[PDB]
């Protein structure tokens, strides 16, 4: 993974040593939300509002 460093010498280390991982239910469900969030923005080519 991406090591914070600030210690030891150089390089990275196994993330499984600290028992840190992302649950599949969190990652898999976040992909469907991230695609639909950017789809709405790219699909809107015009906006109309009023002064408030």
* Nearest CB to another protein, comparing residues 19 and 40: 40
Cα–Cα distance measured from residue 48 to residue 50, given in angstroms and rounded to the nearest whole number? 7
Tokens representing 43 are 């699909």
Residue entry with tokens 């469900």: 29
Is residue 49 close enough to count as binding another protein by CB under 8 A? yes
First-to-last alpha carbon distance for the chain, in angstroms, is 47
Is residue 50 close enough to count as binding another protein by CB under 8 A? yes
Q: How far is the CB of 29 from another protein (least distance, A)?
A: 9
Residues lying near another protein in the complex (CB under 8 A): 32, 39-40, 43-50, 52
């Amino acid at each position: 993974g991406v090591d914070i460093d600030g210690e030891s010498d150089e390089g990275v280390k196994d993330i499984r040593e600290e028992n840190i991982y992302d649950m599949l239910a969190t990652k898999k469900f976040a992909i469907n939300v991230a695609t639909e969030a950017a789809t709405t923005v790219l699909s809107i080519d015009q906006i109309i509002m009023a002064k408030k």
